[PDB]
């Protein structure tokens, strides 16, 4: 997370760390007792390794009373996701067992009503990705409040000339951003999961194009069919 600050320990109990052989690979969101929502492209990066998800964490290395590591039973990427493409970048991870819920571990509700967040609204994004141009990786959870751009500005800025789909949303990337390692992390607006971090900034600290996040409301039907 570029330009943020250290989150308060376990104040965002829905935060998950999707790990590849012990190293943090991507962010994730606990959406149910046994399901973690993240980004599909995160699986591309893991060609032959063991993916597991860490819950109840603040510090990735320090022992904490609520940390629990789980194995992933099934990985369900969106059916229409095409590697080296940006749409349908959603992945549902099923844990080896139902998570032990408590103050530090609890699902976050997600937007099932398909409506746009008001442009100008500050939403919260959390993650353990790169924090500066040097490639420095934090031990503890970071977070930033990012303003959501209006669609036309998102369209024009990102794509150039031809549409930004109705299934994506943009938040400024100018001084605060998501960087590598933050993909799959939540974008929370007013207590509800509104989007999921898409590809992070290529070079942390120097992208001109806004950050793109997948709108979950656009996929409420898919999410529900996988959880049924």
């Amino acid at each position: 997370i570029l330009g943020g600050r250290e989150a308060e320990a376990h104040a965002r109990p829905y935060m998950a760390s999707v790990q590849l052989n012990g190293a943090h690979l991507c962010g994730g969101v606990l959406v149910a007792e046994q399901w973690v929502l993240s980004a599909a492209h995160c699986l591309e990066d893991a060609a032959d390794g063991k993916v597991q998800v860490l819950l109840g964490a603040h510090s990735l290395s320090q022992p904490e009373p609520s940390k629990r590591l789980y194995d992933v039973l099934r990985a369900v990427p969106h059916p229409d996701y095409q590697p080296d493409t940006i749409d349908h970048d959603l992945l549902l991870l099923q844990l080896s067992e139902k998570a032990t819920l408590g103050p530090a571990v609890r699902p976050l509700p997600w937007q099932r009503v398909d409506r746009d967040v008001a442009p100008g609204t500050l939403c919260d994004v959390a993650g353990w990705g790169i924090v500066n141009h040097a490639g420095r990786r934090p031990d503890s959870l970071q977070h930033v409040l990012l303003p959501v751009l209006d669609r036309a500005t998102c369209n024009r800025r990102t794509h150039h000339d031809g549409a930004i789909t109705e299934r994506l949303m943009c938040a400024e990337s100018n001084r605060r951003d998501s960087c590598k390692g933050d993909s799959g992390g939540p974008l929370v607006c007013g207590g509800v999961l509104e989007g999921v971090v898409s590809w992070g900034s290529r070079v942390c600290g120097n992208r001109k194009k806004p950050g793109i996040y997948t709108r979950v409301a656009s996929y409420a039907a898919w999410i529900d069919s996988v959880l049924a």
Side-chain angles (χ1 to χ4, degrees):
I1 293 290
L2 177 81
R5 59 207 196 193
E6 195 183 320
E8 305 72 24
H10 313 108
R12 297 161 173 72
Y14 50 82
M15 201 64 202
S17 173
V18 173
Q19 323 209 132
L20 177 51
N21 292 303
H24 165 83
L25 182 65
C26 281
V29 191
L30 192 68
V31 284
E33 231 199 320
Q34 210 175 181
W35 295 86
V36 161
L37 182 71
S38 182
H41 82 260
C42 292
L43 278 185
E44 283 172 28
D45 314 344
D48 331 275
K50 188 202 242 290
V51 168
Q52 308 178 119
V53 2
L54 176 68
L55 298 181
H58 185 244
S59 166
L60 288 171
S61 62
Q62 293 182 180
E64 294 167 345
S66 55
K67 291 171 99 183
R68 293 288 280 71
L69 185 72
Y70 295 82
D71 283 299
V72 172
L73 211 80
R74 292 177 180 180
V76 188
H78 198 269
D80 305 322
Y81 178 64
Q82 284 294 315
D84 218 317
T85 292
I86 70 191
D87 62 4
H88 315 308
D89 203 7
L90 287 190
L91 167 65
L92 270 169
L93 289 178
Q94 181 175 214
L95 277 9
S96 56
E97 227 207 275
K98 306 87 58 48
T100 300
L101 314 181
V105 191
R106 178 168 175 183
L108 179 66
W110 48 274
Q111 189 53 266
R112 48 172 57 256
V113 170
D114 194 24
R115 192 165 218 214
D116 64 2
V117 172
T121 299
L122 286 185
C123 301
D124 201 27
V125 186
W128 284 275
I130 287 167
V131 294
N132 64 12
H133 189 80
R136 168 182 147 134
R137 292 177 180 180
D139 161 55
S140 286
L141 186 73
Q142 306 297 130
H143 85 99
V144 258
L145 288 164
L146 260 33
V148 329
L149 295 176
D150 64 2
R151 47 199 7 317
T153 298
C154 180
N155 291 13
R156 171 231 306 168
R157 263 185 71 192
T158 57
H159 298 258
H160 178 63
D161 272 341
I164 220 158
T165 76
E166 315 301 283
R167 302 186 100 163
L168 301 181
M169 62 183 296
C170 292
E172 289 185 349
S173 66
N174 281 324
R175 214 265 189 10
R176 305 181 243 294
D177 199 337
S178 64
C179 289
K180 190 165 200 325
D182 293 317
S183 312
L187 171 75
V188 192
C189 311
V192 174
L193 180 64
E194 210 53 79
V196 183
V197 187
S198 198
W199 290 83
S201 184
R202 158 102 292 199
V203 193
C204 199
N206 37 298
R207 93 163 139 179
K208 321 158 185 297
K209 258 100 143 173
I212 192 74
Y213 302 68
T214 305
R215 302 181 63 247
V216 298
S218 299
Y219 294 85
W222 178 62
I223 295 175
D224 278 337
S225 88
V226 173
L227 281 36

